[PDB]
């Protein structure tokens, strides 16, 4: 229910870890 913390630019949300992490470009 509680909305996850928004990831800054350069990060995105990884459901596996329930946290923001580094996230590169999808191709």
């Amino acid at each position: 229910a509680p909305a996850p913390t928004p990831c800054n630019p350069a990060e995105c949300f990884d459901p596996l870890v329930r946290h923001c992490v580094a996230c590169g470009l999808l191709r």
Partner: antibody
Amino acid sequence: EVQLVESGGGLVQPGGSLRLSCAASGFTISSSSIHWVRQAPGKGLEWVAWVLPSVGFTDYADSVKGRFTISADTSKNTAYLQMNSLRAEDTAVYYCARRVCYNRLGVCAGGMDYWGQGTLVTVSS
Amino acid sequence: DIQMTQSPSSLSASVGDRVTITCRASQDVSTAVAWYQQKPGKAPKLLIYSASFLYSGVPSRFSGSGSGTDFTLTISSLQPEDFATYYCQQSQISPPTFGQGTKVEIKR
């Protein structure tokens, strides 16, 4: 380029303990999850643990939970696996791996792209 | 926890054959399945991530599909160097459990 250099393998007594290290280059481990996977002789791949070092979050397979402790040191850019109360069934090649993530609509599209060379742990007297 | 079931356990297929390996999840895992190739006693190799996306460098003859529960790794034209054990892994819900594997042998 990315490199994960493992160390600390070897032979140990049943009940004994051992510490694997997984030293990283070419990226910062704090922003990524580091994972341990292992292969017992003549068995499938078995995921054992992960750590998200930025905050120190962890998760464990039931098979190892309460005996192994995964951790990381951000300044040394290295992750660890402390293994205690070892048993014959822990005899395996232990690999460490990085989970890479790519941004797909705000969430991680990822998998384990870079891997250490794997280090043999033999539990036996 | 979530269980990944691969099929078949193993197979034998000729150079040039299309090879289809299936991988099923006990629960809905979105598209968060990866496919890995492992040569004996060596580090596994990431082939596909997020169900259908190709990891840079991987030969184009490997492809993946599916979402939710049913996933498939396809090798369009089997080459001799492709014998290995192929594993699917889901990373939607921790713990990220592997499937049993599928050992591909080259028929000749």
